[PDB]
């Protein structure tokens, strides 16, 4: 007769990904030969940042966040 | 007769991922040869940051967080 | 008779990805030969940033985040 | 009637003289050696050799090979 | 009637004289050597050799090879 | 009637004299050597050799090869 059949059957197989920062790099034998600083006085004051012959790897990742809002609704 | 059949069967196989920071890197034999600082006096005052021949790996990750809001609703 | 059949069956297999920053690089034996700074006096004041013979890798990633909003609705 | 005389003769020599043979070194003189090294940096393999007087012989070859095949077929 | 005389004779010589043979060194003189090195940097393989007097012989070859094939077929 | 006399004679010589043979060195003199090196940088392979007096002999070749084929076919 008036048979009603409903199949609410969605499928979800997605991917949300974020790759932020320093990923998969290769640093092979870095470094300088000779660094020489000769003086008579070093006078650093009031927010001095000094680097002599150093190797730095810095990474700031304030972002890279994911979000996923998904709703479903079957009204009758 | 007027029979009703409802199959509310959503399937969810998703992935929410975040890879933030420093992942998978390769550092092979870093470092400088010779670093020499010769003076008569070193005078550092009031927020002096000094690096001489050092190797730093720094990482800040204030983000990289995931969020997933999913609602379902069947009304008859 | 008046048989009603409905099949609400979408499929999702998408991908949302973000690769931000420094990925997959190759640095092979970087570094200068000789760096020499000979002076009478070094006087740094009031927000001085000095680099002598250093190797820096810096990475800021304030963004790179994903967002995914998806709704479904079967009204009858 | 058939008659066969298969009599080869062989007196060959296969000689190899490889290297330092028969030399004469009458009072050789090594000098004075000094090696002062400081503040060095090596990032890979190193092979060092220091000395005053030296005799080296290296013979990776000098090998003999001899083949010989005889064959007498009848009918 | 058939008569065959297969009688080869061989007195060959295959000689190899490779290297430093029969030399004379009468009072050779090595000098004084000094090596001062500072603040060096090597990022790969190093092969150093310091000396005063030196005799090197290297013979990667000098090998003999001899082949010989006899064959006597009948009918 | 048939008569065959296969009688080759061989007295050959295949000689090789490669290298430094029969030399005379009467009182050779190496000088004084100094090497001062500072603040160097090498980023790849290095091969150094310092000396005062030197004799090198390198013989990568000098090998003999001898082939010989005999054959006596009948009918």
Swiss-Prot record, chains A, B, C:
- State its location(s): Cytoplasm, Cytosol; Cell membrane; Cytoplasm, Cytoskeleton; Cell projection, Axon
Positions carrying N6,N6-dimethyllysine: 9
Post-translational modification, as annotated: Phosphorylation at serine and threonine residues in S-P or T-P motifs by proline-directed protein kinases (PDPK1, CDK1, CDK5, GSK3, MAPK) (only 2-3 sites per protein in interphase, seven-fold increase in mitosis, and in the form associated with paired helical filaments (PHF-tau)), and at serine residues in K-X-G-S motifs by MAP/microtubule affinity-regulating kinase (MARK1, MARK2, MARK3 or MARK4), causing detachment from microtubules, and their disassembly. Phosphorylation decreases with age.
* Source organism, top-level taxon: Eukaryota
**Placement of Tau/MAP repeats on the sequence:** 4-34, 35-66
Q: Which residues carry this modification: N6-acetyllysine?
A: 9, 15, 19, 29, 41, 45, 67
Q: Where is this site: Not glycated?
A: 9, 15, 19, 29, 38, 41, 68, 73
Modification Omega-N-methylarginine, positions: 47
Positions annotated with a glycan in the UniProt record: 45, 51, 67
Q: Where is this cross-link: Glycyl lysine isopeptide (Lys-Gly) (interchain with G-Cter in ubiquitin)?
A: 9, 15, 19, 29, 41, 45, 51, 67, 73
Q: Which residues carry this modification: Phosphoserine?
A: 3, 22, 50, 54
What tissues contain this protein? Expressed in neurons. Isoform PNS-tau is expressed in the peripheral nervous system while the others are expressed in the central nervous system.
Effect seen on changing residue 67 to I: In PIDB; 90% reduction in the rate of microtubule assembly
Outcome of substituting residue 3 to N: In FTD1; minimal parkinsonism; very early age of onset
Free-text note on domains in this protein's UniProt record:
The tau/MAP repeat binds to tubulin. Type I isoforms contain 3 repeats while type II isoforms contain 4 repeats.
Please describe what this protein does.
Answer: Promotes microtubule assembly and stability, and might be involved in the establishment and maintenance of neuronal polarity. The C-terminus binds axonal microtubules while the N-terminus binds neural plasma membrane components, suggesting that tau functions as a linker protein between both. Axonal polarity is predetermined by TAU/MAPT localization (in the neuronal cell) in the domain of the cell body defined by the centrosome. The short isoforms allow plasticity of the cytoskeleton whereas the longer isoforms may preferentially play a role in its stabilization.
How does it associate, per the subunit comment? Interacts with MARK1, MARK2, MARK3 and MARK4. Interacts with PSMC2 through SQSTM1. Interacts with SQSTM1 when polyubiquitinated. Interacts with FKBP4. Binds to CSNK1D. Interacts with SGK1. Interacts with PIN1. Interacts with LRRK2. Interacts with LRP1, leading to endocytosis; this interaction is reduced in the presence of LRPAP1/RAP.
Q: Which disease is it linked to?
A: In Alzheimer disease, the neuronal cytoskeleton in the brain is progressively disrupted and replaced by tangles of paired helical filaments (PHF) and straight filaments, mainly composed of hyperphosphorylated forms of TAU (PHF-TAU or AD P-TAU). O-GlcNAcylation is greatly reduced in Alzheimer disease brain cerebral cortex leading to an increase in TAU/MAPT phosphorylations.
User: What is the name of this protein?
Assistant: Microtubule-associated protein tau
Gene from which the chain derives = MAPT
Q: Which residues of the full protein are shown?
A: 620 to 695 of 758
From Swiss-Prot, chains D, E, F:
Describe the effect of residue 33 to M.
In FTD1; ultrastructural and biochemical characteristics indistinguishable from Alzheimer disease; accelerates aggregation of tau into filaments
Swiss-Prot/TrEMBL Tau/MAP repeat ranges: 2-32, 33-64
List the carbohydrate attachment sites.
Answer: 43, 49, 65
Q: What is the effect of changing residue 48 to L?
A: In fatal respiratory hypoventilation; unusual apparent autosomal recessive inheritance; reduced binding to microtubules as well as increased fibrillization and aggregation
Name positions with the PTM Omega-N-methylarginine. Answer: 45
So which disease is it linked with? In Alzheimer disease, the neuronal cytoskeleton in the brain is progressively disrupted and replaced by tangles of paired helical filaments (PHF) and straight filaments, mainly composed of hyperphosphorylated forms of TAU (PHF-TAU or AD P-TAU). O-GlcNAcylation is greatly reduced in Alzheimer disease brain cerebral cortex leading to an increase in TAU/MAPT phosphorylations.
Q: What is this protein called?
A: Microtubule-associated protein tau
Instruction: Please specify the portion of the entire protein covered by the chain, as first and last position out of its full length.
Output: 622 to 696 of 758
